[PDB]
Design a protein around this ligand. Sequence first.
Ligand SMILES: Nc1ncnc2c1ncn2[C@@H]1O[C@H](COP(=O)(O)OP(=O)(O)OP(O)(O)=S)[C@@H](O)[C@H]1O
Lengths: 254, 106
Amino acid sequence: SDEINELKEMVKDEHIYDKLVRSIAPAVFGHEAVKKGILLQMLGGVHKSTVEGIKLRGDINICVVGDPSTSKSQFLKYVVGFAPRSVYTSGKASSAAGLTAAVVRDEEGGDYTIEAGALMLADNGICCIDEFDKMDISDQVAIHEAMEQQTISIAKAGIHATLNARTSILAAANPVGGRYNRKLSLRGNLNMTAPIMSRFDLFFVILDDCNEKIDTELASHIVDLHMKRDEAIEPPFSAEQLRRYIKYARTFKP
Amino acid sequence: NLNRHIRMNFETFRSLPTLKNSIIPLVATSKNFGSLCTAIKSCSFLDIYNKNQLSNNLTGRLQSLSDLELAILISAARVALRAKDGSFNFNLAYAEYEKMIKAINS
Ligand SMILES: Nc1ncnc2c1ncn2[C@@H]1O[C@H](COP(=O)(O)OP(=O)(O)OP(O)(O)=S)[C@@H](O)[C@H]1O
């Protein structure tokens, strides 16, 4: 009954949805668009199956794509340290086989078996990724089934199996030319095929442009960070009570 | 002040008849001696004169435009920027203007 009071507070307050969203990236400056996109990530859908016919996905896959110095890797190397059971992979260093599932031999029975991989051991948690563009298609392919069909299926070395990977994913690839010509359009500017461009049920092409009433604030912010003493960064909700509040809210299936 | 205005004319124009055209009104406009003495001591009328001479070369025009004109202008300039030769049709200006408005609403 005690902790019920704590939730009762953090849920009966009026502006929680705002109090939350501006309190997901205490270090990062602003980006109230993306921070929203993340807060919704950790709070999945319902994944409730249809009539016995088929089952449909119930998870969200935000996929940032930003110009240089947009603090897009900070969101990841934060989430993967705050979202439960998560994993951070640079992608281009990794391979597609490693990402979905591995087949390997064991001496116990002299038989082939499964290596969980990032996707299967990332079940019911966000599996963030970096630099899609750098990941050659040979590994971009191995994800699709963990996007919409929600489950991986593998037929190798005699073993046929299928493992369900209910895993939110993410991304942080950079545009084609590192930074992307405002001149050019967006079509011939992302360098990624149609499907994997669609399966991402968010999209955030983050820009980076000049200003004064912005860049001054940003610089003051970064400085205050590097001025440890000026860690006034305390947001309303700590990075802990947010966890318990989620672990509650994960259960409503409206 | 008058010294400063003379120096300005010298550095930029370096031409007496220009300054003469500036003086003619300032003198001839006054009605009483005290007013003229005040003027030549302050030479404030030279300010308005410079301004009006300058009024609508290219900046005043830009300033005397309403919203929608400014929008068409900005969007057309962006279209010119995209293409290399700067040559932009009217249709391109309109399409870019439309998507800009779509963004503003968005
Ligand atoms: N909006 C911001 N506010 C404060 N600091 C920022 C911001 N954006 C970037 N930084 C800082 O600048 C550094 C670069 O950030 P990022 O651009 O996210 O690096 P990154 O994730 O490697 O980007 P790429 O695309 O992978 S090269 C980070 O270490 C941040 O601390």
